[PDB]
Amino acid sequence: NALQNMDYKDYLKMSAGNVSEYPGSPEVFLSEQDAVKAAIDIVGKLLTGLGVPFVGPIVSLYTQLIDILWPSKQKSQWEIFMEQVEELINQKIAEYARNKALSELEGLGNNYQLYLTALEEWKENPNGSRALRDVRNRFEILDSLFTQYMPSFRVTNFEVPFLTVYTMAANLHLLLLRDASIFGEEWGLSTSTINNYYNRQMKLTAEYSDHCVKWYETGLAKLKGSSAKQWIDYNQFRREMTLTVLDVVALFSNYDTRTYPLATTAQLTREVYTDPLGAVDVPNIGSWYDKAPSFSEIEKAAIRPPHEFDYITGLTVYTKKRSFTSDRYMRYWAGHQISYKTIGTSSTFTQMYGTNQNLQSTSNFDFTNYDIYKTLSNDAVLLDIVYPGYTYTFFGMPETEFFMVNQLNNTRKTLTYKPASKDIIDRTRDSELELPPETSGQPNYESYSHRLGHITFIYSSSTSTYVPVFSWTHRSADLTNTVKSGEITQIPGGKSSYIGRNTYIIKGRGYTGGDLLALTDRIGSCEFQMIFPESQRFRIRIRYASNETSYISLYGLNQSGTLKFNQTYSNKNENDLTYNDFKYIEYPRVISVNASSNIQRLSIGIQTNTNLFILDRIEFIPVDETYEAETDLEAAKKAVNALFTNTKDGLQPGVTDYEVNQAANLVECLSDDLYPNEKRLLFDAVREAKRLSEARNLLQDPDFQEINGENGWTASTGIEVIEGDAVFKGRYLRLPGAREIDTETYPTYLYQKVEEGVLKPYTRYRLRGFVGSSQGLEIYTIRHQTNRIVKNVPDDLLPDVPPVNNDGRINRCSEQKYVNSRLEVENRSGEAHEFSIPIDTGELDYNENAGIWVGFKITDPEGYATLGNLELVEEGPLSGDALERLQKEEQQWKIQMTRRREETDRRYMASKQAVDRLYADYQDQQLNPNVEITDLTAAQDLIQSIPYVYNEMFPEIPGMNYTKFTELTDRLQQAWGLYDQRNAIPNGDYRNELSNWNTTSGVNVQQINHTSVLVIPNWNEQVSQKFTVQPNQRYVLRVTARKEGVGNGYVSIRDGGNQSETLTFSASDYDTNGMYDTQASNTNGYNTNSVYNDQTGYITKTVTFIPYTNQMWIEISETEGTFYIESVELIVDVE
Secondary structure (H helix, E strand, O other), rough: OOOOOOHHHHHHHHHOOOOOOOOOOOOOHHHHHHHHHOOOOOOOOHHOOOOOOOOHHHHHHHHHHHHHHHHOOOOOHHHHHHHHHHOOOOOOOOOHHHHHHHHHHHHHHHHHHHHHHHHOOOOOOOOOOHHHHHHHHHHHHHHHHHHHHHHHHOOOOOOOOHHHHHHHHHHHHHHHHHHHHHHHHHHOOOEEEEEEHHHHHHHHHHHHHHHHHHHHHHHOOOOOOOOOHHHHHHHHHHHHHHHHHHHHHHHHHHOOOOOOOOOOOOOOOOOOOOOOOOOOOOOOOOOOOOOOOOOOHHHHHHHHOOOOOOOEEEEEEEEEEOOOOOOEEEEEEEEEEEEEEEEOOOOOOEEEOOOOOOOEEEEEEEOOEEEEEEEEEEEEEEEEEEEEEEEEEEEEEOOOEEEEEOOOOOOEEEEEEOOOOOEEEEEEEEEOOOOOOOOOOOOHHHHHOOEEEEEEEEEEEEOEEEEEEEEEEEEEOOOEEEEOOOOOOEEEHHHOOOOOOOOOEEEOOOOOOOOOOEOOOOOOOOEEEEEEHHHHHEEEEEEEEEEOOOOEEEEOOOOEEEEEOOOOOOOOOOOOOOOOOOOEEEEEEEEEEEEOOOOEEEEEEEEOOOEEEEEEEEEEEEEEOOOHHHHHHHHHHHHOOOOOOOOOOOEOOEEEEHHHHHHHHHHHOOOOOOHHHHHHHHHHHHHHOOOHHHHHHHOOOOOOOOOOOOOOEOOOOOOOEEOOOOOOOOOOEOOOOOOOOOOEEEEEEEEEEEEEHHHOOOEEEEEEEEEEEEEEEEEEEOOOOOOEEEEEEOOOOOOOOOOOOOOOOOOOHHHHHHHHHHHHHOOOOOOOOOEEEEOOOOOOOOOOOOOOEEEEEEEEOOOEEEEEEEEEEEEEEEEHHHHHHHHHHHHHHHHHHHHHHHHHHHHHHHHHHHHHHOEOOOOOOOEEOOOOOOHHHHHHHOOOOOOEEEEOOOOHHHOOOHHHHHHHHHHHHHHHHHHHHHHOOOOOOOOOOOOOEEEEEOOOEEEEEOEEEEEEOOOOOOEEEEEOOOOOOOOOEEEEEEEEEEOOEEEEOOOOOOOEEEEEEOOOOOOOOOOOOOOOOOOOOOOOOOOOOOOOOOEEEHHHEEOOEEEEEHHHHHHHHEEEEEEEEEEEOOO
């Protein structure tokens, strides 16, 4: 039945089994198909040998490439590649340049065929200089031929005509240089010569990619028009040049043998569109596009916007009938609903196309578990002539056969749409003319290159346009996202799954073999669903682009964590990306999956900082069981080595104490079982490094063991020392916020002085440390000038996901791996965790002994900081601009000090004399009898007026005059001590508040001018004391007081007998009688007065007294107003 009209060639291509007919024209007729046939075969063979570094497969590959590109047939395959593009864009390449290129490419052929033999010779005798000289030399020859010839395939004004040639040539050149890096050392080639081949490969891979994309776009943009006819030509260029150019360009990055050192599977996820299913150039009738929608309307209708990868599961076709008379009618595809889905997910999607109004019938097709590898359609016309002689035409699609192969068990099946028509003009359309299979010894149901993906539709009621359009996906894109053990598996971002969320997909340009997944603030995550049929360990690698540096996070496959990505491009729209804008990042965590038939899920997200991240593809790379252990050894040997000078017995100057700790933590990652000796020697190294750090640190007590001790740190109350905690190894400080109590705030402070004796002249020092986190942390350096910076450091070094678990213990290896991924960000801003502050010396002075103070302070109640790894180190001598700057600072300070010593000496000498005059002797051991409370307060006022006692910016720290202030204060307190001892009235100056006094409830002691005074606020209040004295000697009672307001203040003393004295105080104790107008003394016309200058201080009054008993009473009271008592003293009279 199928056998009778069949050719002998078709019968032999059938074989093992029974198939149908499959009538195709491979190579014959139009040679756009012969070009497309060749591109499809070439791309198909390249796909089975990406990454593979083995001689037999490579030899075998080159064999098939050469048989395609240089057949023994009549016409050159290159000329056909020219005819292909020239006939699409209606432009011939000029004669002289056309004939030159062909001549050079015939020559390339000869040389390539000489390259092949020398390659097969080396796969027999691989050891010695026989087939080794041939091949290494035939290689060199081809490199120079490509260098000389590539410009020949991009003659200006003819870049598009030549595009398929340029691309096929460029492909071979990159393929050739790949041979150098795989068979490099084996062909006896220097390490340095490979690098120059490799570097060029990478340079060329960009230049050749960027060229092909750029001229694809130009080419395509030239074919934009406004008619349906012009659209067909546009889409034909788009389809054919995708197969023939972009599909090849997509492969170029896989020829990088250092990025891809073993077998790799790539996936082409782009869709392509066969020509619309309508009749064209029916003789004497025309074409479906004669009367049809515009270019824009068709592009809108027929072509899908970028979407997640999908496949077809079901179809419902709506059928209508056209009939101008009976005896002649068409039933035709008027519309459809198509069902489809993304990988994994069991969510079904439906779209409707065309019309479903006024139907004859409906046909349903189920496609689940089947690929459609071929369609046979009918492009049809209904012609009828109605009275009185008009002609009417109608174009529709009345029949399709869909050829199907089962995905699971390889069974084959046909479904047919064929409603009843009568007396139409038919022509069949075979998809295999546009998307042929690969040429194998195997039938098209094994070797098919594409499968039916979707069905769109061109509809207009006005023009009676009803035209299906079929879209197709490439075989290399699987429907399961299977990840195999033996290989690097690539999964493009387009193959992510629909989970109910929106998602943003950017159209690709050709570089990636499909469209690009983007993550943005508005739609921040994506999910992959994958089958792992084998247990295996993988590392994950991501190919991406971004305009910013930030972090992605990964969750699934039994883990979760975070990966920094770096800016790859700048100042570009995300649709103008070129080859070199894409880079790779490597997730350091090895991942272990168990074999399963069920889907396993990896979701990728961005932080809430991040604005843009563009995902090309994720990659799974097989790693072996010891890979984790090996790479931890390398990382630790590197970090430890970086601490030391070349002799290995000193620290590098710019290595911090924090970095020594970091390295020590990484050493702990090493396997005890695999690498015992290495771990032991790397620990000896870091311990020594740590001893060197401490030896060069000029700060005392760097491990915080002696806070507030003699020579070390001075610290405010509330500062905590913490041991055995996250982030810091060993001990560190937590500084709390400033303490608020009512109207007072008390700042947190920490400081130390480094003495002039350990320093050097004209030398730069560095204060360094590590801040875990902070808010309002003020850092001070003091020598001559005071400098302050403020550091606010985020709390970003702890993971948010708690990963400690039941295993509550700290693991320094994993902790330091996380922290390192966060210091990576190259800050030196105020926000960075490290800090390093210069402090410069000029000349040293041992007398003045300024030294260097380093200080920390928090004045904010909401402030805090964690602080560790503090050091002050010598960097070295000052030169150049640093030295000029310092000499200016020093000069300015010398001149300013001179004015400050002038001011100090006035105030100091007046303070010194006021204290000296208090004593009789000169060992401050005896008070003068005359000193009264007013001599003591006068002294205090003067001592308080000495300037520059404390540093102006950091008052807790001593200033230049501190020693002077303290000396005098001690001598004053001594004298005040003696005053209290001499006074027979206990607590007569109220320095112990109200001790020893009987008072009513309203009486109080106020501090006025830094001294204690008793206040009697109302007349019903009183004070008294009984105390013992030595009787029958003479005392003097001295009272210093002030009476305000109406009435009198009284101080009464009595003994136990008949002796009694009263002193009286009133407001009238001030009254002065004036001068009497300068007692009129002047002559000749001047009679000025004065300003009778009156103030308000205390009055001192005295009385003598001889007690005749050993008990005395003193009583203090008033009749009205307010009474202030500064002191009552009773002393032995030596007058």
